[PDB]
Amino acid sequence: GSHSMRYFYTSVSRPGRGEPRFISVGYVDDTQFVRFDSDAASPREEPRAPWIEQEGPEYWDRNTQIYKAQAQTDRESLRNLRGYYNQSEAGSHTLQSMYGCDVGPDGRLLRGHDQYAYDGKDYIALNEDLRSWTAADTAAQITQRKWEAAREAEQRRAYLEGECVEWLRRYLENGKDKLERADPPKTHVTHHPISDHEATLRCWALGFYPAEITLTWQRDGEDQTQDTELVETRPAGDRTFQKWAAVVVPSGEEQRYTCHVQHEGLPKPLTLRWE
Protein backbone atom coordinates (compact mmCIF):
# COMPACT_ATOMS: atom_id res chain seq x y z
CA GLY A 1 0.00 0.00 0.00
CA SER A 2 1.07 3.61 0.69
CA HIS A 3 4.25 4.20 2.77
CA SER A 4 6.04 7.05 4.57
CA MET A 5 9.59 7.86 5.66
CA ARG A 6 10.19 10.67 8.19
CA TYR A 7 13.12 12.27 10.04
CA PHE A 8 12.23 14.29 13.18
CA TYR A 9 14.93 16.68 14.58
CA THR A 10 14.76 18.49 17.97
CA SER A 11 17.37 21.17 18.90
CA VAL A 12 17.03 22.60 22.45
CA SER A 13 19.21 25.46 23.80
CA ARG A 14 20.10 25.08 27.52
CA PRO A 15 21.94 28.31 28.49
CA GLY A 16 23.83 27.84 31.80
CA ARG A 17 23.31 24.00 31.60
CA GLY A 18 25.44 23.25 28.49
CA GLU A 19 25.55 23.50 24.66
CA PRO A 20 22.28 22.89 22.71
CA ARG A 21 21.13 19.22 22.49
CA PHE A 22 20.29 17.66 19.08
CA ILE A 23 18.12 14.48 18.77
CA SER A 24 17.19 12.86 15.45
CA VAL A 25 14.85 9.86 14.92
CA GLY A 26 14.10 8.11 11.61
CA TYR A 27 10.83 6.35 10.99
CA VAL A 28 9.39 4.18 8.25
CA ASP A 29 5.62 4.17 8.75
CA ASP A 30 5.13 3.55 12.50
CA THR A 31 8.61 1.96 12.98
CA GLN A 32 11.66 3.83 14.39
CA PHE A 33 14.80 2.51 12.57
CA VAL A 34 17.63 4.96 13.62
CA ARG A 35 18.43 7.61 16.22
CA PHE A 36 21.13 10.19 16.93
CA ASP A 37 21.44 11.97 20.32
CA SER A 38 24.24 14.57 20.81
CA ASP A 39 24.10 13.84 24.61
CA ALA A 40 25.20 10.17 24.10
CA ALA A 41 28.96 9.59 24.78
CA SER A 42 30.85 9.91 21.41
CA PRO A 43 27.49 10.06 19.58
CA ARG A 44 26.79 8.10 16.38
CA GLU A 45 23.70 7.13 14.38
CA GLU A 46 22.43 3.94 16.01
CA PRO A 47 20.11 1.21 14.71
CA ARG A 48 16.62 0.86 16.26
CA ALA A 49 15.15 -1.90 13.91
CA PRO A 50 16.81 -5.24 13.06
CA TRP A 51 16.57 -4.84 9.24
CA ILE A 52 18.81 -1.65 9.18
CA GLU A 53 21.74 -3.35 11.04
CA GLN A 54 23.09 -4.95 7.77
CA GLU A 55 23.90 -1.43 6.33
CA GLY A 56 27.73 -1.16 6.07
CA PRO A 57 30.06 1.14 8.02
CA GLU A 58 29.88 3.86 5.24
CA TYR A 59 26.10 4.26 5.91
CA TRP A 60 26.62 4.80 9.71
CA ASP A 61 29.76 7.00 9.24
CA ARG A 62 28.19 9.36 6.64
CA ASN A 63 24.81 9.67 8.53
CA THR A 64 26.71 10.46 11.81
CA GLN A 65 28.58 13.27 9.95
CA ILE A 66 25.22 14.59 8.55
CA TYR A 67 23.62 14.74 12.07
CA LYS A 68 26.70 16.54 13.57
CA ALA A 69 26.65 19.09 10.65
CA GLN A 70 22.81 19.49 11.03
CA ALA A 71 23.20 19.97 14.83
CA GLN A 72 25.74 22.81 14.15
CA THR A 73 23.44 24.41 11.49
CA ASP A 74 20.57 24.22 14.10
CA ARG A 75 22.81 25.91 16.76
CA GLU A 76 23.32 28.83 14.29
CA SER A 77 19.54 28.85 13.43
CA LEU A 78 18.75 29.09 17.22
CA ARG A 79 21.14 32.12 17.61
CA ASN A 80 19.61 33.79 14.47
CA LEU A 81 16.00 33.11 15.63
CA ARG A 82 16.49 34.70 19.12
CA GLY A 83 17.95 37.64 17.09
CA TYR A 84 14.77 37.86 14.92
CA TYR A 85 12.49 37.72 18.03
CA ASN A 86 14.89 39.90 20.13
CA GLN A 87 14.83 37.15 22.86
CA SER A 88 17.11 36.89 25.97
CA GLU A 89 20.35 34.79 25.82
CA ALA A 90 19.18 33.27 29.18
CA GLY A 91 16.04 31.46 27.82
CA SER A 92 15.83 27.84 26.55
CA HIS A 93 14.30 27.64 22.98
CA THR A 94 13.26 24.73 20.72
CA LEU A 95 13.70 24.24 16.95
CA GLN A 96 11.91 21.17 15.50
CA SER A 97 12.25 19.90 11.91
CA MET A 98 10.20 17.22 10.17
CA TYR A 99 10.70 16.00 6.57
CA GLY A 100 10.22 12.97 4.32
CA CYS A 101 8.17 11.36 1.59
CA ASP A 102 4.99 9.33 1.00
CA VAL A 103 5.07 6.69 -1.81
CA GLY A 104 2.09 4.79 -3.31
CA PRO A 105 1.86 0.98 -3.83
CA ASP A 106 3.98 1.42 -7.05
CA GLY A 107 6.78 3.07 -4.97
CA ARG A 108 6.36 6.46 -6.78
CA LEU A 109 6.42 9.80 -4.86
CA LEU A 110 2.94 10.99 -3.71
CA ARG A 111 4.09 14.01 -1.62
CA GLY A 112 7.15 15.54 0.11
CA HIS A 113 7.33 17.39 3.45
CA ASP A 114 9.92 19.81 4.96
CA GLN A 115 8.51 21.90 7.89
CA TYR A 116 9.78 23.58 11.09
CA ALA A 117 8.44 24.80 14.44
CA TYR A 118 10.10 27.31 16.82
CA ASP A 119 9.00 27.17 20.52
CA GLY A 120 6.09 24.83 19.58
CA LYS A 121 4.66 27.06 16.75
CA ASP A 122 4.74 26.54 12.94
CA TYR A 123 7.61 28.72 11.58
CA ILE A 124 8.20 27.83 7.86
CA ALA A 125 7.03 24.96 5.59
CA LEU A 126 7.87 23.80 2.05
CA ASN A 127 4.62 23.91 -0.01
CA GLU A 128 3.34 20.79 -1.85
CA ASP A 129 4.92 22.10 -5.13
CA LEU A 130 8.33 21.54 -3.33
CA ARG A 131 9.38 24.92 -4.91
CA SER A 132 7.99 27.65 -2.55
CA TRP A 133 7.84 28.34 1.22
CA THR A 134 4.99 29.54 3.50
CA ALA A 135 6.23 31.69 6.46
CA ALA A 136 4.17 32.04 9.70
CA ASP A 137 5.32 35.60 10.71
CA THR A 138 7.82 38.39 9.78
CA ALA A 139 10.79 36.49 11.42
CA ALA A 140 10.07 33.44 9.14
CA GLN A 141 9.90 35.82 6.11
CA ILE A 142 13.60 36.65 6.83
CA THR A 143 14.42 32.88 6.66
CA GLN A 144 12.23 32.65 3.50
CA ARG A 145 14.12 35.46 1.64
CA LYS A 146 17.47 33.82 2.68
CA TRP A 147 16.34 30.30 1.59
CA GLU A 148 14.92 31.66 -1.77
CA ALA A 149 18.28 33.47 -2.41
CA ALA A 150 20.18 30.18 -1.63
CA ARG A 151 17.60 28.09 -3.65
CA GLU A 152 17.06 25.82 -0.54
CA ALA A 153 13.74 24.49 -2.02
CA GLU A 154 15.67 22.79 -4.92
CA GLN A 155 18.03 21.10 -2.35
CA ARG A 156 14.91 19.84 -0.48
CA ARG A 157 13.14 18.70 -3.70
CA ALA A 158 16.27 16.77 -4.89
CA TYR A 159 16.23 14.78 -1.58
CA LEU A 160 12.43 14.20 -1.57
CA GLU A 161 12.35 13.03 -5.25
CA GLY A 162 15.69 11.14 -5.07
CA GLU A 163 17.25 9.67 -1.88
CA CYS A 164 14.01 9.86 0.21
CA VAL A 165 12.06 7.62 -2.27
CA GLU A 166 15.08 5.39 -3.14
CA TRP A 167 16.10 4.70 0.51
CA LEU A 168 12.40 4.18 1.57
CA ARG A 169 12.05 1.58 -1.24
CA ARG A 170 15.29 -0.13 -0.10
CA TYR A 171 14.06 -0.20 3.58
CA LEU A 172 10.60 -1.60 2.49
CA GLU A 173 12.43 -4.50 0.69
CA ASN A 174 14.98 -5.21 3.56
CA GLY A 175 12.39 -4.78 6.34
CA LYS A 176 9.43 -6.14 4.37
CA ASP A 177 8.72 -8.87 6.97
CA LYS A 178 8.03 -6.10 9.60
CA LEU A 179 6.90 -3.16 7.37
CA GLU A 180 4.87 -4.80 4.57
CA ARG A 181 3.19 -7.16 7.12
CA ALA A 182 0.81 -6.26 9.99
CA ASP A 183 0.97 -8.03 13.41
CA PRO A 184 -2.53 -8.57 14.88
CA PRO A 185 -3.21 -7.80 18.55
CA LYS A 186 -3.42 -10.32 21.37
CA THR A 187 -7.02 -9.69 22.61
CA HIS A 188 -9.03 -10.40 25.77
CA VAL A 189 -11.85 -8.90 27.86
CA THR A 190 -11.42 -8.27 31.60
CA HIS A 191 -14.23 -7.69 34.17
CA HIS A 192 -13.92 -4.96 36.90
CA PRO A 193 -16.76 -4.39 39.45
CA ILE A 194 -17.19 -0.57 40.13
CA SER A 195 -20.34 -0.42 42.39
CA ASP A 196 -22.92 -2.91 43.73
CA HIS A 197 -24.71 -3.79 40.40
CA GLU A 198 -22.29 -2.63 37.60
CA ALA A 199 -18.96 -3.89 36.08
CA THR A 200 -16.47 -2.26 33.66
CA LEU A 201 -15.79 -4.55 30.66
CA ARG A 202 -12.36 -3.68 29.17
CA CYS A 203 -11.46 -4.93 25.69
CA TRP A 204 -7.64 -5.20 25.30
CA ALA A 205 -5.58 -5.13 22.06
CA LEU A 206 -1.86 -5.79 22.88
CA GLY A 207 1.24 -5.92 20.65
CA PHE A 208 -0.32 -4.87 17.31
CA TYR A 209 1.42 -3.18 14.30
CA PRO A 210 0.66 -0.81 12.69
CA ALA A 211 -0.88 1.62 15.26
CA GLU A 212 -4.16 2.10 13.30
CA ILE A 213 -6.94 0.04 15.03
CA THR A 214 -10.69 0.25 15.84
CA LEU A 215 -12.12 -1.21 19.08
CA THR A 216 -15.98 -1.01 19.29
CA TRP A 217 -18.37 -2.20 22.03
CA GLN A 218 -21.88 -3.35 21.01
CA ARG A 219 -24.82 -4.22 23.35
CA ASP A 220 -27.12 -6.71 21.49
CA GLY A 221 -25.55 -5.52 18.19
CA GLU A 222 -26.12 -1.80 19.11
CA ASP A 223 -23.07 0.55 18.87
CA GLN A 224 -21.96 1.74 22.38
CA THR A 225 -19.26 4.22 21.08
CA GLN A 226 -21.00 7.17 22.88
CA ASP A 227 -20.64 5.35 26.26
CA THR A 228 -17.16 3.82 25.51
CA GLU A 229 -13.89 4.97 27.20
CA LEU A 230 -10.94 4.66 24.71
CA VAL A 231 -7.32 5.20 25.84
CA GLU A 232 -4.86 6.77 23.39
CA THR A 233 -2.89 4.13 21.45
CA ARG A 234 0.39 3.59 23.37
CA PRO A 235 3.74 1.92 22.59
CA ALA A 236 4.27 -1.59 24.10
CA GLY A 237 8.00 -0.71 23.98
CA ASP A 238 8.97 -3.40 21.47
CA ARG A 239 7.76 -1.53 18.32
CA THR A 240 4.19 -2.80 18.73
CA PHE A 241 1.23 -0.87 20.20
CA GLN A 242 -1.55 -1.29 22.84
CA LYS A 243 -5.10 0.05 23.18
CA TRP A 244 -8.23 -0.75 25.20
CA ALA A 245 -11.93 0.26 25.19
CA ALA A 246 -14.08 0.12 28.40
CA VAL A 247 -17.92 0.16 28.93
CA VAL A 248 -19.90 0.06 32.23
CA VAL A 249 -22.50 -2.80 32.08
CA PRO A 250 -25.07 -4.32 34.48
CA SER A 251 -23.56 -7.32 36.36
CA GLY A 252 -24.80 -10.61 34.72
CA GLU A 253 -25.57 -8.90 31.31
CA GLU A 254 -21.90 -9.12 30.12
CA GLN A 255 -22.76 -11.69 27.36
CA ARG A 256 -24.93 -8.99 25.69
CA TYR A 257 -21.65 -7.02 25.01
CA THR A 258 -19.41 -7.84 22.00
CA CYS A 259 -16.04 -6.11 21.48
CA HIS A 260 -15.28 -5.73 17.75
CA VAL A 261 -11.57 -5.49 16.77
CA GLN A 262 -10.59 -4.16 13.30
CA HIS A 263 -6.83 -4.31 12.42
CA GLU A 264 -4.84 -4.88 9.15
CA GLY A 265 -3.24 -7.95 10.87
CA LEU A 266 -6.71 -9.64 11.17
CA PRO A 267 -8.01 -11.35 8.00
CA LYS A 268 -11.53 -11.02 9.59
CA PRO A 269 -12.50 -8.51 12.33
CA LEU A 270 -12.77 -10.26 15.77
CA THR A 271 -15.90 -10.39 17.99
CA LEU A 272 -14.99 -10.92 21.69
CA ARG A 273 -17.16 -11.52 24.77
CA TRP A 274 -16.23 -11.64 28.47
CA GLU A 275 -15.36 -15.31 29.35
Binding site: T10, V12, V25, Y27, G120, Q242
Partner: protein, 100 residues
Amino acid sequence: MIQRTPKIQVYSRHPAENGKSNFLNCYVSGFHPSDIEVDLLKNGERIEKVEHSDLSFSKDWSFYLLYYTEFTPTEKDEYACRVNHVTLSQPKIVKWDRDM
Protein backbone atom coordinates in the same frame (compact mmCIF):
# COMPACT_ATOMS: atom_id res chain seq x y z
CA MET B 1 6.44 30.24 23.22
CA ILE B 2 3.72 27.50 23.30
CA GLN B 3 3.50 25.28 26.43
CA ARG B 4 1.50 21.98 26.44
CA THR B 5 0.70 19.79 29.49
CA PRO B 6 1.89 16.13 29.57
CA LYS B 7 -0.61 13.27 29.21
CA ILE B 8 0.55 10.20 31.23
CA GLN B 9 -0.24 6.47 30.96
CA VAL B 10 1.35 3.90 33.32
CA TYR B 11 1.00 0.24 32.21
CA SER B 12 2.80 -3.10 31.77
CA ARG B 13 4.02 -4.37 28.36
CA HIS B 14 2.35 -7.78 29.06
CA PRO B 15 -0.67 -8.75 31.23
CA ALA B 16 0.59 -8.76 34.87
CA GLU B 17 1.06 -12.00 36.80
CA ASN B 18 2.43 -11.70 40.32
CA GLY B 19 5.88 -13.23 40.31
CA LYS B 20 6.55 -13.10 36.53
CA SER B 21 9.06 -10.80 34.73
CA ASN B 22 7.39 -7.90 32.82
CA PHE B 23 8.05 -4.24 31.85
CA LEU B 24 6.68 -1.15 33.65
CA ASN B 25 5.89 1.59 31.07
CA CYS B 26 5.31 5.30 31.67
CA TYR B 27 4.20 6.92 28.38
CA VAL B 28 4.33 10.75 28.49
CA SER B 29 2.90 12.62 25.47
CA GLY B 30 1.42 15.94 24.27
CA PHE B 31 4.04 18.04 26.17
CA HIS B 32 5.99 21.22 25.19
CA PRO B 33 8.71 22.16 25.78
CA SER B 34 10.90 18.97 25.89
CA ASP B 35 12.52 19.57 29.35
CA ILE B 36 10.87 16.97 31.65
CA GLU B 37 11.68 14.78 34.70
CA VAL B 38 10.20 11.23 34.67
CA ASP B 39 10.82 8.68 37.48
CA LEU B 40 9.38 5.21 38.05
CA LEU B 41 8.47 4.61 41.75
CA LYS B 42 8.28 1.48 43.92
CA ASN B 43 6.29 2.11 47.17
CA GLY B 44 6.77 5.86 46.53
CA GLU B 45 10.61 5.70 46.09
CA ARG B 46 12.64 6.40 42.89
CA ILE B 47 13.79 3.30 40.90
CA GLU B 48 17.46 3.88 39.82
CA LYS B 49 17.62 1.82 36.53
CA VAL B 50 15.05 3.30 34.04
CA GLU B 51 15.41 3.26 30.19
CA HIS B 52 13.86 5.95 27.89
CA SER B 53 12.92 6.20 24.19
CA ASP B 54 14.45 8.75 21.75
CA LEU B 55 12.59 12.12 21.84
CA SER B 56 9.97 12.32 19.05
CA PHE B 57 6.80 14.38 18.50
CA SER B 58 3.29 14.32 16.95
CA LYS B 59 1.52 16.32 14.17
CA ASP B 60 0.94 19.28 16.56
CA TRP B 61 4.76 19.28 17.39
CA SER B 62 4.09 18.05 20.98
CA PHE B 63 6.74 15.61 22.36
CA TYR B 64 6.40 12.00 23.53
CA LEU B 65 8.77 9.72 25.52
CA LEU B 66 8.46 6.17 26.87
CA TYR B 67 10.24 5.46 30.21
CA TYR B 68 10.40 1.77 31.20
CA THR B 69 12.14 -0.84 33.38
CA GLU B 70 11.97 -4.58 33.70
CA PHE B 71 10.04 -5.50 36.92
CA THR B 72 8.23 -8.40 38.65
CA PRO B 73 4.77 -7.30 39.86
CA THR B 74 3.54 -8.46 43.36
CA GLU B 75 0.23 -8.19 45.29
CA LYS B 76 1.54 -5.66 47.91
CA ASP B 77 4.10 -3.46 46.04
CA GLU B 78 2.80 -0.23 44.47
CA TYR B 79 4.44 1.09 41.23
CA ALA B 80 3.89 4.58 39.84
CA CYS B 81 5.29 7.20 37.44
CA ARG B 82 6.25 10.72 38.65
CA VAL B 83 6.46 13.54 36.07
CA ASN B 84 7.63 17.14 36.49
CA HIS B 85 7.23 19.72 33.70
CA VAL B 86 6.96 23.59 33.59
CA THR B 87 3.13 23.25 32.87
CA LEU B 88 2.51 21.32 36.16
CA SER B 89 1.65 23.04 39.49
CA GLN B 90 3.64 20.16 41.12
CA PRO B 91 5.09 16.70 40.26
CA LYS B 92 2.22 14.53 38.96
CA ILE B 93 2.17 10.90 40.25
CA VAL B 94 0.07 8.28 38.35
CA LYS B 95 -0.11 4.84 39.99
CA TRP B 96 0.15 1.60 38.02
CA ASP B 97 -3.21 -0.23 37.88
CA ARG B 98 -2.69 -3.73 36.29
CA ASP B 99 -6.32 -3.45 34.93
CA MET B 100 -5.49 -0.40 32.69
